[PDB]
Structure formats: C-alpha cells, structure tokens
Enzyme design. Sequence first.
Site, PDB file in Angstrom:
ATOM      1  N   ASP A 118      11.058  -3.306  35.718  1.00 49.21           N
ATOM      2  CA  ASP A 118      11.010  -4.577  36.387  1.00 49.21           C
ATOM      3  C   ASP A 118      12.110  -5.420  35.746  1.00 49.21           C
ATOM      4  O   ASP A 118      13.306  -5.060  35.792  1.00 49.21           O
ATOM      5  CB  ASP A 118       9.601  -5.233  36.279  1.00 49.21           C
ATOM      6  CG  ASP A 118       9.467  -6.472  37.217  1.00 49.21           C
ATOM      7  OD1 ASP A 118       9.689  -6.254  38.423  1.00 49.21           O
ATOM      8  OD2 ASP A 118       9.159  -7.625  36.782  1.00 49.21           O
ATOM      9  N   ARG A 145      20.076 -10.813  39.810  1.00 46.53           N
ATOM     10  CA  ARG A 145      19.166 -11.758  39.150  1.00 46.53           C
ATOM     11  C   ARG A 145      19.604 -11.998  37.707  1.00 46.53           C
ATOM     12  O   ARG A 145      18.921 -11.578  36.757  1.00 46.53           O
ATOM     13  CB  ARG A 145      17.755 -11.167  39.189  1.00 46.53           C
ATOM     14  CG  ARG A 145      17.248 -11.016  40.630  1.00 46.53           C
ATOM     15  CD  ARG A 145      15.974 -10.207  40.757  1.00 46.53           C
ATOM     16  NE  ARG A 145      15.564 -10.104  42.171  1.00 46.53           N
ATOM     17  CZ  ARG A 145      14.557  -9.340  42.584  1.00 46.53           C
ATOM     18  NH1 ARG A 145      13.863  -8.627  41.704  1.00 46.53           N
ATOM     19  NH2 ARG A 145      14.219  -9.301  43.872  1.00 46.53           N
ATOM     20  N   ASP A 178      12.079 -12.354  31.793  1.00 47.61           N
ATOM     21  CA  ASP A 178      11.654 -13.197  32.933  1.00 47.61           C
ATOM     22  C   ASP A 178      10.849 -14.394  32.422  1.00 47.61           C
ATOM     23  O   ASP A 178      10.354 -14.377  31.270  1.00 47.61           O
ATOM     24  CB  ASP A 178      10.768 -12.382  33.889  1.00 47.61           C
ATOM     25  CG  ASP A 178      11.546 -11.362  34.687  1.00 47.61           C
ATOM     26  OD1 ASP A 178      12.796 -11.410  34.822  1.00 47.61           O
ATOM     27  OD2 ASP A 178      10.885 -10.514  35.262  1.00 47.61           O
TER      28      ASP A 178
HETATM   29  O1  LIG Z   1      -2.097 -13.175  30.596  1.00 49.78           O
HETATM   30  C1  LIG Z   1      -1.842 -12.318  31.478  1.00 49.78           C
HETATM   31  O2  LIG Z   1      -1.514 -11.133  31.195  1.00 49.78           O
HETATM   32  C2  LIG Z   1      -1.930 -12.734  32.933  1.00 49.78           C
HETATM   33  O3  LIG Z   1      -1.684 -11.588  33.762  1.00 49.78           O
HETATM   34  C3  LIG Z   1      -1.931 -11.810  35.149  1.00 49.78           C
HETATM   35  O4  LIG Z   1      -1.072 -12.599  35.796  1.00 49.78           O
HETATM   36  C4  LIG Z   1       0.315 -12.275  36.023  1.00 49.78           C
HETATM   37  C5  LIG Z   1       1.120 -13.563  36.184  1.00 49.78           C
HETATM   38  O5  LIG Z   1       0.971 -14.344  35.008  1.00 49.78           O
HETATM   39  C6  LIG Z   1       0.623 -14.330  37.402  1.00 49.78           C
HETATM   40  O6  LIG Z   1       1.391 -15.530  37.629  1.00 49.78           O
HETATM   41  C7  LIG Z   1       0.806 -13.432  38.616  1.00 49.78           C
HETATM   42  O7  LIG Z   1       2.044 -12.974  38.844  1.00 49.78           O
HETATM   43  C8  LIG Z   1       2.092 -12.749  40.270  1.00 49.78           C
HETATM   44  C9  LIG Z   1       2.461 -11.316  40.572  1.00 49.78           C
HETATM   45  O8  LIG Z   1       1.367 -10.414  40.369  1.00 49.78           O
HETATM   46  C10 LIG Z   1       3.643 -11.016  39.678  1.00 49.78           C
HETATM   47  O9  LIG Z   1       4.018  -9.651  39.863  1.00 49.78           O
HETATM   48  C11 LIG Z   1       4.800 -11.942  40.078  1.00 49.78           C
HETATM   49  O10 LIG Z   1       5.979 -11.618  40.613  1.00 49.78           O
HETATM   50  C12 LIG Z   1       6.885 -12.419  41.387  1.00 49.78           C
HETATM   51  C13 LIG Z   1       6.563 -12.210  42.855  1.00 49.78           C
HETATM   52  O11 LIG Z   1       5.181 -12.465  43.079  1.00 49.78           O
HETATM   53  C14 LIG Z   1       6.874 -10.769  43.226  1.00 49.78           C
HETATM   54  O12 LIG Z   1       6.554 -10.537  44.593  1.00 49.78           O
HETATM   55  C15 LIG Z   1       8.356 -10.569  42.995  1.00 49.78           C
HETATM   56  O13 LIG Z   1       9.289 -11.187  43.719  1.00 49.78           O
HETATM   57  C16 LIG Z   1      10.698 -11.017  43.597  1.00 49.78           C
HETATM   58  C17 LIG Z   1      11.328 -12.234  44.268  1.00 49.78           C
HETATM   59  O14 LIG Z   1      10.835 -13.411  43.587  1.00 49.78           O
HETATM   60  C18 LIG Z   1      10.953 -12.213  45.749  1.00 49.78           C
HETATM   61  O15 LIG Z   1      11.674 -13.225  46.437  1.00 49.78           O
HETATM   62  C19 LIG Z   1      11.269 -10.868  46.417  1.00 49.78           C
HETATM   63  O16 LIG Z   1      12.616 -10.981  46.556  1.00 49.78           O
HETATM   64  C20 LIG Z   1      13.348 -10.852  47.786  1.00 49.78           C
HETATM   65  C21 LIG Z   1      13.202  -9.433  48.326  1.00 49.78           C
HETATM   66  O17 LIG Z   1      11.826  -9.061  48.473  1.00 49.78           O
HETATM   67  C22 LIG Z   1      13.741  -8.455  47.311  1.00 49.78           C
HETATM   68  O18 LIG Z   1      13.788  -7.184  47.977  1.00 49.78           O
HETATM   69  C23 LIG Z   1      15.133  -8.808  46.798  1.00 49.78           C
HETATM   70  O19 LIG Z   1      16.099  -8.304  47.713  1.00 49.78           O
HETATM   71  O20 LIG Z   1      15.378 -10.204  46.597  1.00 49.78           O
HETATM   72  C24 LIG Z   1      14.800 -11.184  47.465  1.00 49.78           C
HETATM   73  C25 LIG Z   1      14.783 -12.455  46.648  1.00 49.78           C
HETATM   74  O21 LIG Z   1      15.138 -12.439  45.441  1.00 49.78           O
HETATM   75  O22 LIG Z   1      14.391 -13.503  47.170  1.00 49.78           O
HETATM   76  O23 LIG Z   1      10.600  -9.809  45.692  1.00 49.78           O
HETATM   77  C26 LIG Z   1      11.112  -9.759  44.349  1.00 49.78           C
HETATM   78  C27 LIG Z   1      10.652  -8.539  43.597  1.00 49.78           C
HETATM   79  O24 LIG Z   1      10.212  -7.581  44.264  1.00 49.78           O
HETATM   80  O25 LIG Z   1      10.738  -8.526  42.342  1.00 49.78           O
HETATM   81  O26 LIG Z   1       8.599 -10.737  41.594  1.00 49.78           O
HETATM   82  C28 LIG Z   1       8.339 -12.049  41.081  1.00 49.78           C
HETATM   83  C29 LIG Z   1       8.601 -11.987  39.597  1.00 49.78           C
HETATM   84  O27 LIG Z   1       8.847 -13.026  38.934  1.00 49.78           O
HETATM   85  O28 LIG Z   1       8.584 -10.849  39.069  1.00 49.78           O
HETATM   86  O29 LIG Z   1       4.421 -13.329  40.175  1.00 49.78           O
HETATM   87  C30 LIG Z   1       3.212 -13.560  40.897  1.00 49.78           C
HETATM   88  C31 LIG Z   1       2.836 -15.005  40.905  1.00 49.78           C
HETATM   89  O30 LIG Z   1       3.611 -15.829  40.379  1.00 49.78           O
HETATM   90  O31 LIG Z   1       1.759 -15.314  41.463  1.00 49.78           O
HETATM   91  O32 LIG Z   1       0.007 -12.268  38.434  1.00 49.78           O
HETATM   92  C32 LIG Z   1       0.436 -11.478  37.319  1.00 49.78           C
HETATM   93  C33 LIG Z   1      -0.420 -10.250  37.235  1.00 49.78           C
HETATM   94  O33 LIG Z   1      -0.258  -9.504  36.241  1.00 49.78           O
HETATM   95  O34 LIG Z   1      -1.247 -10.027  38.156  1.00 49.78           O
HETATM   96  C34 LIG Z   1      -3.443 -11.924  35.287  1.00 49.78           C
HETATM   97  O35 LIG Z   1      -3.862 -11.937  36.664  1.00 49.78           O
HETATM   98  C35 LIG Z   1      -3.894 -13.210  34.615  1.00 49.78           C
HETATM   99  O36 LIG Z   1      -5.326 -13.172  34.568  1.00 49.78           O
HETATM  100  C36 LIG Z   1      -3.286 -13.419  33.211  1.00 49.78           C
HETATM  101  O37 LIG Z   1      -4.249 -13.033  32.216  1.00 49.78           O
HETATM  102 CO    CO Z   2       8.851  -9.504  35.410  1.00 49.36          CO
END
Ligand SMILES: O=C(O)[C@H]1O[C@H](O[C@@H]2[C@H](O)[C@@H](O)[C@@H](O[C@@H]3[C@H](O)[C@@H](O)[C@@H](O[C@@H]4[C@H](O)[C@@H](O)[C@@H](O[C@@H]5[C@H](O)[C@@H](O)[C@@H](O[C@@H]6[C@H](O)[C@@H](O)[C@@H](O)O[C@@H]6C(=O)O)O[C@@H]5C(=O)O)O[C@@H]4C(=O)O)O[C@@H]3C(=O)O)O[C@@H]2C(=O)O)[C@H](O)[C@@H](O)[C@H]1O
Ligand code: CO
EC number: 4.2.2.2
Length: 399
Positions: free
Chosen positions: A223, A279, A227
Amino acid sequence: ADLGHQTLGSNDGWGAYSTGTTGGSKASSSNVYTVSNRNQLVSALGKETNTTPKIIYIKGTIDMNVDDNLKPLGLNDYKDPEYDLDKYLKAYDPSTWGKKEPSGTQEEARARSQKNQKARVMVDIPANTTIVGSGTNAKVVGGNFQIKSDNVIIRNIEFQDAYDYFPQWDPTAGSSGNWASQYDNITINGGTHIWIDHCTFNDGSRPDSTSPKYYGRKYQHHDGQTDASNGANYITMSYNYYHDHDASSIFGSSDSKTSDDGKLKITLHHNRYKNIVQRAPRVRFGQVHVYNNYYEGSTSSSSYPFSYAWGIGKSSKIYAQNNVIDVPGLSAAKTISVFSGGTALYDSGTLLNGTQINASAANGLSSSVGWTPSLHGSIDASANVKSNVINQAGAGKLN
Ligand SMILES: O=C(O)[C@H]1O[C@H](O[C@@H]2[C@H](O)[C@@H](O)[C@@H](O[C@@H]3[C@H](O)[C@@H](O)[C@@H](O[C@@H]4[C@H](O)[C@@H](O)[C@@H](O[C@@H]5[C@H](O)[C@@H](O)[C@@H](O[C@@H]6[C@H](O)[C@@H](O)[C@@H](O)O[C@@H]6C(=O)O)O[C@@H]5C(=O)O)O[C@@H]4C(=O)O)O[C@@H]3C(=O)O)O[C@@H]2C(=O)O)[C@H](O)[C@@H](O)[C@H]1O
Ligand SMILES: [Co+2]
C-alpha cells in the site's frame, strides 16, 4: 547529541509547531532500549500507556513476519482454514460475480486471514518516543509502524516491503477494479508532532514486478510508504529516500473527511523519490510545504513507471518551492494530477528535466494557497537540489 537524543530543530517544518517534536530525547536510563528482533521491539514499545520519554535503537534487521519465537511466518501460517486463493479468485471473477463488492465465504475468510497477519506486522508507537537505526544497516522488514500519538521521531531506518499476503479484490476501484492491501511502512493515523528523517522506504526483495495479474489487474501486496490520515497534524518528513514502489504518500484519506480541513500540516523537504509511480504526495485539505525534493523516474519503465508527483486533491493547499523533477519526455502539466475539488497550487522554482516550469499555471490552478510556511530551514537553489538530495537522503547517510 546522537540521533537517539536529538530533537527536531525549532524551525524545521510543521513538526516544530507549538510544543514541537522532541520524541524521547529526555528518556531516563531505564527507558533507553536497544532492540534487534520483533520481541525486543514490541517489549520496548509496550502499550499506549507507555508515554514516558523513551529512546529505541534498532540494531540490524527486524523481520516483523515472525512468531513469538522469531520463527518466520508466511502465507500458509496466516491463512484462515476456510480461505483458498483459487476459490477466492473463482468466487469474485467479474465474469461470473459482476461488479458487486466481494462478500460471502471466501471474502470473510480472506478478511480473517488478513487480521492474522496484521496482529504480527502492525505496531503502534506510543507518545514521546524516538526510534532510530544504529549504524548504516538498521532495517524494519514487513512491518507497519502506526502513529496515533503525539511527539514521535523515526530516523535512520530502512523500511522494506510492508507486504500483505491477502490482497482484497475491489471491482469498483478505478475504471477496471483493483486489488488493495493494508500495510504502509508508516501510517500516521491522527498522530501529531512527528519527524520522519533519513529513513529509506522500498519494496525490499518483492517488488511489484514479481506479482502476477488476476482479472487483468496487478495482485498488489503493498500500500503506501508514509501515509497520514484522520486529523494527523504537525509533521516534518525530511531527507528520506523513497524508491521502487507504487503509491508513496497519501495525506488525507477521504473527500468526506472534512474534519481534516485545517489539519494535515506537513512539511516534506530534501526527500528523494526514485521509481515511485504516484502520490508523492497526494493531498486533501492540508497545508503541505513541499520544498527541495528530487523526483526521478521514467514513464516507460516496465517496473514502476512514473505517473505523477503531486496529487492536487480536494481543497489541498500544497506550497511547492524549489523541487526538481527528472522524468524524460514528461510535460509540465503531467508532473501533477488534479482530482475533483483541487483548485490551487503555489508553485515556485520547479525544474523539470533542467528547465524552469510552472505545473500550477499549466493546469489552470490558482497560484496562491492562502498561506506561506514560516517554519523552514535554509532553501537550496533548485540548481543544487538533485545533488544535495542524492548525496544526503535516506538511511545510512549519517549514522
Ligand atoms: O487503530 C486502528 O488500527 C484503527 O484501524 C481501523 O481504521 C482504519 C483507519 O484508521 C480508518 O480511518 C479507516 O480507513 C478507511 C479505509 O478502511 C482505509 O483503507 C482508508 O483508505 C483510503 C480510502 O478509503 C481507500 O479507498 C483508498 O483510496 C485511494 C484514493 O484516496 C482514492 O481516491 C482512490 O483513488 C482513485 C482511484 O480509485 C485509484 O485507482 C487511483 O487511480 O487514484 C484515484 C485518486 O487518487 O483519486 O482509491 C485509492 C486507493 O485505492 O488507494 O485509500 C485511502 C488511503 O488513505 O489509503 O481510509 C478509510 C477512511 O478514511 O475511512 O479504516 C481503517 C481500517 O483499518 O479499517 C479500525 O477500523 C479502527 O477501529 C481503528 O482501531
Ligand atoms: Co496506507
């Protein structure tokens, strides 16, 4: 002072704001540790309640994919009894499953399998902590440091190959679906006052070119590298060497997370990004100072071809100063990617292939982002950035 005891300089980027970043510099004698394996590392970190100032020296290579006796663990050790790769692939093939999110037996088993690995590889770093590599060969392999706390310094470590044995298929990610994994080298999840300095981030022995494609898409085991999410704030990342890896740094994880507005104050300076696809960083909301970094790659590389350096995401406030980008044949416009809601980029001194350019203007963006960084050290002329950054960035450059 040594790296274990130095603090972030009072002018060195957003990490120096307010109470600043002193990590564990004031550690008393029983709160200094030297660690050379996962058990020792985990013991030294302890729990969230371990907030006394502490210094942890990493000696040699720490493999995080190991059991409590340090025996190496791989796919078959983590697999849930009901998970099977071939059946997972058969269940979720777009050809028969369509584009709905995977659900049911195999996806549930895959999710449990992934939690089995998370329990070994992901560790939280408690408040008031400095972790630094000893010598030139300190390594964290397969680990994902997570920082939710305040006042943390990480330096002089080579982070390799934060590898997820159970990538999840998502048919609705992007125009043609994508496989997604969970582990970054470092995840700052609401962490504040953090300095990441003179570390190296790469994919170790398992670069993405060793993964097959399933459903036409790369079976992605990685990943991010560094971040920052969920109101993370006041962070300096300096002199790091990110190389040979797809997605480097996403600051602000979601357009809907408007609580990130006014936070994600991060300074990136003197970092080297070589063979990084995208990124670097991709930003939503934050005031991010990006200066004197060097980016180098090729759009035609088979392994990790360059796509873009800065991601101008929703309401981002990137302030770019004297950065140097070396990607043959790339246009000024294509140095960045602009995503919905991104409308502004301060851009001064950018060199692309030795020529002064303005990516912001070339993309029709506003030339001001409503702020000017006050906390920074000396600004190198762009003409000297490549040399200074190649010479100085990454682990094993100090010691
Ligand atoms: O302490 C703990 O351990 C904690 O753990 C949990 O919580 C964590 C986290 O803290 C929570 O906030 C949440 O995170 C959510 C999700 O599960 C997590 O993976 C994450 O990721 C982001 C997005 O949700 C992903 O979809 C992804 O997105 C990126 C881009 O941002 C997005 O635009 C898209 O990009 C497009 C295209 O799709 C792509 O193909 C590419 O071409 O680019 C474009 C573009 O850039 O715009 O998709 C990408 C991608 O695939 O990576 O990634 C994001 C990221 O930052 O990585 O954030 C979520 C959220 O904020 O809600 O959940 C986490 C989890 O572990 O479940 C526990 O739940 C909690 O109890 C706590 O205990
Ligand atoms: Co990450």
